[PDB]
Design a binder for this molecule. Structure first.
Ligand SMILES: OC[C@H]1O[C@@H](O[C@H]2[C@H](O)[C@@H](O)[C@@H](O)O[C@@H]2CO)[C@H](O)[C@@H](O)[C@@H]1O
Length: 358
């Protein structure tokens, strides 16, 4: 629709890069003009991997208008560390994104535990090395975006967590510099790096960034929990006071790094409540105004507020099939409240929700 000129497909935009625009670093296509990516995140491929199918990726690219998709490969929580076969879905997903003209974020979904250096995540370097080797001479290699650690956090379920401060950021930096260097040996593909407190801290990254090209830093927000703000931190505010996630994004951009909202949801961060649509409006107007790409959480029919698809609810609904079939569209009532809203926001169309009574 109108105002969608920056939301270009990879066939048009080509290799991504960061350019200075208004004294801030922003995502751009090959020709230097700003590019913004909008799309969806899978839930963990070990639980809801059936979304990686032909008709669903066609639906998300054409009917929903997405020019990007994110593949969330958990490692702990029965992901890649214990079932290696989840990696097969990352490959299949890249192949379909290639085919249906979407950039694809390969996400090493650090989560439980929250320290990316934990033993359970020891396969990270080899994982990224393997995938990058497979695709380095492919003509569509530039479609791939690497995301090295979903959410550095204090989560200690399955190993150590991290602190919300410089020590925490230095732990992530320590983890990522080897992998960045090896990935830069294989190509120039964008690398998105998470940061403390469930990637709410791009501002810490701005204060001590990785010395490499095409590195962007994550922000993750859930509109039921992370309140919008218009006052940026005063010049010289120490990191100890930087608690507001929106102001943390403004600080990162104002202090010279680029940002990518690699995961956001319409619920509270505790997974549910809402959806919170007037605040998601304020947040997406903020992202869109500042050319920050975004991926919404998530492509599941699980019965949780952030889930994009209608769940099974005994008295009222059957769960939407994660393959939409040959028509390659999911009908409006097969989308949950969140899914229906996010599809309209990815498309850039007016939000006109169906009456869920009838
Ligand atoms: O249903 C699959 C698993 O879900 C896990 O909860 C997820 C939640 O659904 C997501 O929104 C995100 O918050 O991550 C959560 C935890 O990783 C749940 O913890 C597991 O027990 C389920 O098997």
């Amino acid at each position: 629709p109108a105002g969608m000129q920056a939301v270009k497909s990879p066939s048009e935009a080509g290799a991504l890069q960061l350019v200075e625009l208004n004294g801030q670093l922003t995502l751009a296509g090959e020709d230097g003009t700003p590019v913004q990516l909008r799309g969806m995140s899978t839930h963990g491929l070990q639980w809801f991997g059936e979304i990686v199918n032909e008709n669903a990726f066609v639906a998300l690219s054409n009917d929903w208008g997405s020019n990007m998709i994110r593949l969330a490969m958990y490692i702990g929580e029965n992901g890649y560390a214990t079932n290696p076969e989840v990696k097969d879905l990352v490959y299949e997903g890249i192949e379909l994104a290639f085919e249906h003209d979407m950039y694809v974020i390969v996400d090493w979904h650090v989560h439980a535990p929250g320290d990316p250096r934990a033993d359970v995540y020891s396969g990270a370097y080899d994982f990224f090395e393997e995938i990058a080797d497979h695709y380095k001479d492919h003509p569509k290699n530039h479609y791939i975006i690497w995301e090295l650690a979903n959410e550095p956090s204090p989560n200690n379920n399955g190993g150590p967590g991290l602190t919300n401060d410089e020590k925490g950021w230095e732990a992530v930096k320590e983890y990522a510099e080897p992998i960045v260097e090896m990935l830069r040996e294989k190509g120039d593909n964008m690398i998105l790096v998470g940061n403390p407190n469930w990637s709410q801290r791009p501002d810490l990254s701005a204060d001590n960034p990785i010395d490499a090209e095409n590195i962007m830093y994550s922000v993750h927000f859930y509109t039921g929990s992370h309140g919008a703000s218009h006052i940026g931190y005063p010049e010289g505010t120490p990191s100890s006071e930087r608690s507001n996630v929106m102001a943390n994004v403004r600080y990162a951009l104002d202090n010279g790094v680029a940002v990518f909202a690699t995961e956001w949801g319409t619920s509270q961060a505790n997974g549910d409540g809402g959806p919170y649509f007037d605040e998601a409006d304020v947040w997406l107007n903020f992202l869109n105004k500042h050319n920050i790409s975004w991926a919404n959480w998530s492509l599941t029919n699980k019965n949780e507020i952030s889930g994009a698809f209608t769940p099974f609810e005994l008295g009222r609904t059957d769960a939407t099939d994660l393959d939409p079939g040959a028509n390659q569209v999911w009908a409006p009532e097969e989308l949950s409240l969140s899914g229906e809203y996010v599809r309209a926001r990815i498309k850039g169309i007016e939000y006109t929700p169906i009456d869920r009574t009838k």
